[PDB]
Structures are given as C-alpha cells and as structure tokens.
Write a protein that binds this ligand. Structure first.
Ligand SMILES: [Cl-]
Ligand SMILES: [Zn+2]
Ligand SMILES: [Zn+2]
Lengths: 215, 220
C-alpha cells in the first residue's frame, strides 16, 4: 500500500533528492539504511539505490517513482531497447538539479581540430550506449572501452586515447590533464513514474506530491 | 606491447588475484589505490578495475588477460550477445579460488518446487543468468535488478525472492534466507582476448600458464 520512491543512495543526486522530497512534505530519516527508509508522516517508502539501477526499477515496475539523471535514464533505456525490450516510463518533471554534461575529452597536449580526430581512437566511458549513438549519428568510427570508474585515468594508464566523461565544473578533467573537446549530451535530474497504472490511493498521493513539486 | 592483465580492484577476488600473480613469479609494486600497477620483473601492466568491467575489457580487446569469476563473465557474455554483439574470449584456466554459487533463495519462513517461484518478483544482480535459467525451466517471473543489497530486497518488500551470489564458506542463515536451487556454480578463471597476441606476448602468457599449473598443484 505504500508508494515506493527510488533515489540515489550516495552521489550527485542524493542530497538534493532528499531536500526536494522534504520540501514536498515527505518526512523521513536518512541514516545509513542499506535499502529502505520509511516516511514517518505519509504512506511512502524511499528506496536508496545505486543510480544505475533506478531506470530499470521503473521500467520493471518494481517501484512507483524515481529521481534520476537523464543521462543514466537514457543510457539504460538504450541498453534495454538494444536487448529488443520496450522500456517505458512516465516523465513527470524535469528538475532544477543534477546539471552535468557528457563530453569527449583528450589529453591536454593533443592538437584537436575536428570530431574527425576521434576516428579510430579507443574511447573510455561509463556510458557506452550514449557514446555509441553519438558516434553513429556523426559517422565516426572508434573502439570502445567501458569502465565504470576511474575513466579519466584511462589515457595515462594507456588503455584509451580519449574519454567520454560526465563533467560539471571541469575540475576532474584539469586534475587529469585532459581538456573537454565536445559536449555530446546535457543532463539534469528528472522525476519519473512507472508505466502501469497505480492503484487509486497511490495515484492520488502521486498527484498530491506533483502539486507540491510544482509548488 | 606490454602484456595487460585486468584484475578486480577490491572485492571477492582482488587479494587472491594479486596473490596468484606473485605465486607465478610476477613481482609487482602497488604504490596507490589506482587503476594501474606494473610488474617489477616482467613487462606487464596490471589494471585494477571493477569486476563487472573485466569481461567487456577482454571482449573489446582493451586488455590481454583477465582474472574473473565465471558468473560475472557469463552474465556479461549473455548481455553482449543479447545486444546483438559477438563477445569472444579464450578460457585459459579455471582457477583454485573464487568459488561461489548463484542460488535462488527464499525467506526462511516460506514453504518451498521451482514452480513455487512462478509469478514471483525476484531481485538479482545477474538478471541475464536468472532470465536464462527461468526460461529453460519454463517458470515465469518478475525481474528486479539491484547492483547491491540484493539480500535485503525481500525484508524491504521490494521482491519475494532473490537470485543471490553466495561465497564458499558462507551461508544465508544470518540474513534469514534459505537457498533452494543453485542455478550457476562459479569459480575464478583466467581468460584472454580473442585476437592473436604478438609472438612475444604470447610467449610470456605461455610461461605464466605453466607456472599457474605448477602453483595450483603445489597448493592442494
Ligand atoms: Cl618502484
Ligand atoms: Zn532516525
Ligand atoms: Zn615501487
């Protein structure tokens, strides 16, 4: 009977997802719960999960609502489509946090003229589907390297020539002596809902939060 | 032109992987907790990554060798094949560590046959392995993919059952669950990328492989 809302357990979106929910009247205590936190004033459960699992939890109808970045959402949507599946979700609201971009970057010392310079390069990324689609759209051939973390270290480790990296301030690129060369995707946080109809009580509650989110 | 070997950075296989390399005569220094480390006596780069990335690095030819659990290798192979790709690798050796089992498990209070899983929501980090098993056995189910905290999903009423990886030497009694069916038995493996190596690198792999065999016999 309780609404299930998935949010990122720790990372970019965590703090502001919890802040948003509170401002919408959802009271809860976030301590170190491994998976679930229970709202103390409303019939709502907060599932604290790895960001990468949120799109799938929505697609699979496991949870009702989720707060997730467009990049993670689209990466996983593309993965599921490529498996021949039909992932679907309701977009409820584009949010005012989670701002970041996914960009091609090169070692500082490289002379870069064009996207054509990425031809035949090995490119390290945590977003292989998003990278793949961009490169196909622009007719550039390359070799993939999928790494879930430490992407920016790939060139120094001689694993890749270049990277496709999620960037906000430029600080981590600077630290790894890399330079942003081409933005391929721009992302923000979004609130989404599972496709299948909620029970009457649950949808009413969703409608109530959506009022205050708009608020 | 240096041999690249990918191993788990930290987790179920990390210690045992670096130990196997030492046992085989590969000396190395680890100066920091970062992606790359190097052998001191041989022309080898040691890449320390998330386990889940190792199959892909091998399929994509990014590295030459990998040490990885069969479960993780098979999950990602199935994933890549289901994407329309043709993941390929050489299996060099099944190793003497990383023993673990992917098991359907239920809450201890539940009355458990496999058709008892029919229609249940099943949480897992290995959705392809689960899907394949359930299709082979004609049991319909609802998927729940979680990268972590799988064992908490039923107590959180997020799922009815789990398909969980359990280590040799460990049980689920503490988490209040019962293993019902092992669907996959796994150990650590040494694998190689598909495209031929240079003669020099292949020669070093051969030398390592002889040593691995001697090490495993001497450890029994
Ligand atoms: Cl040194
Ligand atoms: Zn409290
Ligand atoms: Zn040293």
């Amino acid at each position: 009977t309780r609404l299930r809302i998935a949010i990122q357990k720790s990372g970019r979106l965590s703090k502001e997802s919890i802040e948003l929910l509170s401002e919408c009247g959802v009271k809860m205590h976030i301590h170190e719960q491994s998976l679930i936190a229970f709202s103390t004033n409303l019939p709502i459960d907060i599932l604290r999960v790895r960001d990468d699992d949120i799109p799938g939890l929505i697609f699979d109808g496991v949870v009702d609502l989720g707060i997730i970045g467009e990049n993670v959402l689209e990466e996983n949507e593309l993965e599921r489509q490529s498996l021949g599946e039909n992932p679907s979700y309701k977009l409820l609201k584009k949010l005012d946090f989670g701002y970041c971009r996914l960009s091609l970057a090169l070692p500082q010392e490289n002379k870069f003229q064009n996207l054509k310079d990425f031809e035949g390069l090995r490119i390290a990324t945590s977003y292989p589907q998003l990278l793949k689609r961009f490169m196909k759209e622009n007719g550039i051939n390359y070799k993939n390297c999928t790494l879930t973390g430490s992407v920016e270290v790939a060139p120094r480790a001689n694993l890749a020539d270049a990277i496709c990296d999620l960037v906000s301030s430029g600080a981590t690129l600077q630290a790894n002596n890399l330079k942003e060369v081409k933005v391929i995707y721009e992302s923000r946080a979004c609130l989404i809902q599972k496709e299948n109809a909620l029970s009457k009580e649950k949808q009413a509650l969703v409608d109530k939060i959506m009022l205050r989110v708009a608020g």
